[PDB]
Write a protein that binds this DNA or RNA. Structure first.
Ligand SMILES: [Mg+2]
Ligand SMILES: [Mg+2]
Ligand SMILES: [Mg+2]
Ligand SMILES: [Mg+2]
Lengths: 16, 223, 22, 234, 232, 240, 20, 21
RNA sequence: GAUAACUGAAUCGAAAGACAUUAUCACG
RNA sequence: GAUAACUGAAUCGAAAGACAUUAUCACG
């Protein structure tokens, strides 16, 4: 859920 | 295919300068925090963990600042020349990932648990900035690698693969957007300098927010 | 020695391709 | 320019397998520790820090295990081809992976074996979930040797730069300049053939497998200690 | 030579009620503090020390509230006989309770207002968890006056001894020897000769001490409000 | 009823001497501990707390040692004298001192043997300046017996009241009412019944038997305080 | 788990019965 | 000095019944 | 640089003696 | 009431099995 995603961030373009 | 120019040397130095600015922002604010933490007995070992991290960042910074790009460039493929620069970015980015989790999440909770003193915490806005800067350096890193098709399993960033595996299982997100290949060095240079402008924008916002927190720590504890 | 403890928490074979006294 | 062979593919795979063994030893013991720590309320956030670290190691391990070396090596045809890859070019990203990993282990080992150890005693008032002294010894011994192996690969082929420098190696050097035998300061002999790299590589392989078995053995002892002193019923 | 009356029973109950009010002010504010401290992991054992103290106060308070004074005062075949109790004999255990309590408050105040305050700043740097300067002033002012009232009861009826001496009173005296006075503890207790006189002076003390306990309450309310707003 | 004798003066002095021995055992060991603790920066404030406690004990000890019992006991002239003191009246302030002391020891023991012990481990990450388990046992055994001796003096002469109740004794009683342990012969020292005494000769006899027991406990206490002072010397005081 | 003693688990006493 | 006096009060500080200066 | 001050009488030292003209700590 | 949630694959249980329909904590 958002516990898995919380290890990757603490939050809620050229060549792209 | 794609080949070096005499202007390639400076393009590398300019990219590396961003990384040094990113590293240096953290080192400055962490030095201040580590000093304030001296005065909190219950945070003595968390402090030593932060010292360990800051030493690592400091080392990456001396490494980057001492790197003379011209000593490693000739004739060489542009591929070959960008590869170790990209590779440094990846090592740094994964270090920041580890540090950000500790600094902005675990430690923040620990600080409140141990002290209930919000004067020692980061501001919400500094956390936002931290994450925004990280996301963009991750994406810039991915751009450099995928644009020149120099990627592999070993240069994959954890956060990028996590986003991808999450979209497969679930079925807009910055990490999932497609990198267009580049065909000339003139094109890489153009897009690079546009990235440079964006990332400098993020690092100034970051600096601004690190100032705000450092000021708070000064006023609420001070010298 | 207070600086050295951030690099190992610990206070004589040949290794391949490593000249021994150096 | 030293050149690739058909046997080069397997040499890379063999080097990467060591890295995978090193990563996997940590992941196994950490998975255990993280599970035990679920039952200790005061170590809740330290636990999440460990999870973050173990995830990173796990990712490096999947990355390494999924890397098909042959897909990145142009190979020798018989020997002549000027478009076949340099051995330099092929080892470089392997070495570079080792460096990233080794610096991650450095960060982790300090947390795991020093800070957290002190914190565990402070918070719990016992030794039941600390590491053994011998496991710490093994951890450091294994790290030291993987650092030195990493340096060997890089300096032997003269493919180093400021960006591939390991923090612990530069620290040792700067400390000797200021101060007036130490594994990190010993000189790397250059290598001239791939046949020579292979020979020395396999000798390193034997040494490092030796260190990883000692590590495994000590990780087994602590997992048992954790079981006897904390996990089991009373 | 100094005898009980039927009114003596109520004079004792009134004195004891002050002690109960003093004990209860502390118990109230400490119950709050102990609760706030439950959320601070680094102050876990300091909290248990406070609980130990607050339990002791609470016990002295139940003891005092459940004491029926009349059950220990022989009024006698009314105002006649040598069988009826001396006023001395009756005040003695009341005074003695005051002394035990006062020495407990001394131990507690040092911990609460000095050691623990410093420890709180060392561990947390969080001044939200400290007492106000004004609460500390009040604590010390109330203590001083209960010490002096206790001494008055004892020395006025000449019922004192080495065993009823208060540490703070002897300390003041020994400090003046080694060194008319401005110091409350060194000033002389006049003897009393009737119970009517004791009663009069007692009620004047009662008025003063109630004044100190209201100031104390007021400052405990200020610090409790701070603790409520800043945590709870 | 029960009346003083010329021998009463010395009986009081003897009782008070035990209290002084109890106090002095603590003061000695605490003085040592406080000195050791001067060299531990992280235990600076805990140290000041201990000093506050040890000062209180020291004061009770000077008070007791300076008390001249004869100055507060009006003896009788040839036997009956209607101005001579009741034995009741004379024991009361002695008992009352014991109670004040015992409740002080209760507060101190919790700090010393529980809170502070945990804090020492938390802060220092070692056992070098913790107490031994045996010293804790002795502390608690001595406390228990002085509590019981104090209760004996008070209940034997029926001189008790709500104000002389010991916290630990009431706690044991209220705990047995609620749980149902006050039925039958209990194994709990605090719940066992005090027999009344009727003569001073009887009090004296039982008193001296208590005296023998308590001196036994204080020697065990002293022995364990010597062991832990040695431990503190070997593990902390002596440098290499 | 006690405020009253650190030794939970603790022979005839003068002037005392064995009886509650 | 004032370290001895600090065990007895937390204050600078130091009319009353039965009391004559 | 920071921290440590019960006239307490202990502590450290085989002893002489030491004890804020001191001691301990430190990415510092 | 509060606290604890890596799809991690360990942990706990001799077994059956357990694992937020859970677990732990809390001034007599
Ligand atoms: Mg930690
Ligand atoms: Mg943490
Ligand atoms: Mg304290
Ligand atoms: Mg404590």
């Amino acid at each position: 859920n958002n516990k898995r995603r919380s290890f990757y961030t603490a939050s809620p373009l050229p060549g792209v | 295919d794609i080949k070096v120019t005499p202007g390639t040397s400076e393009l590398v130095e300019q990219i590396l300068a961003l990384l040094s600015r990113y590293l240096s922002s953290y080192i400055h604010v962490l030095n201040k925090f580590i000093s304030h933490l001296r005065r909190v007995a219950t945070l003595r070992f968390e402090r030593t963990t932060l010292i360990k991290f800051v030493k690592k960042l400091r080392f990456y910074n001396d490494s980057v600042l001492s790197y003379n790009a011209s000593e490693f460039i000739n004739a060489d493929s542009f591929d070959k020349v960008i590869l170790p620069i990209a590779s440094m970015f990846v090592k740094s980015v994964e270090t920041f990932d580890l540090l950000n989790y500790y600094l902005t999440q675990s430690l923040q909770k620990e600080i409140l648990s141990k002290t209930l003193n919000e004067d020692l915490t980061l501001t919400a806005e500094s956390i936002l900035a931290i994450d925004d800067t990280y996301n963009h350096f991750v994406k810039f890193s991915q751009w450099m690698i995928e644009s020149l098709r120099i990627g592999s399993n070993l240069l994959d960033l954890e956060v990028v693969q996590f986003a991808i595996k999450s979209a497969d299982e679930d079925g807009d997100n910055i990490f999932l957007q497609e990198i267009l290949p580049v065909n000339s060095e003139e094109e890489f240079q153009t897009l690079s300098a546009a990235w440079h402008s964006i990332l400098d924008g993020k690092l100034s916002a970051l600096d601004e927010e690190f100032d705000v927190v450092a000021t708070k720590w000064h006023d609420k504890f001070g010298k | 020695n207070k600086r050295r403890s951030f690099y190992t928490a610990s206070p004589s074979p040949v290794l391949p391709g490593v000249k021994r006294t150096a």
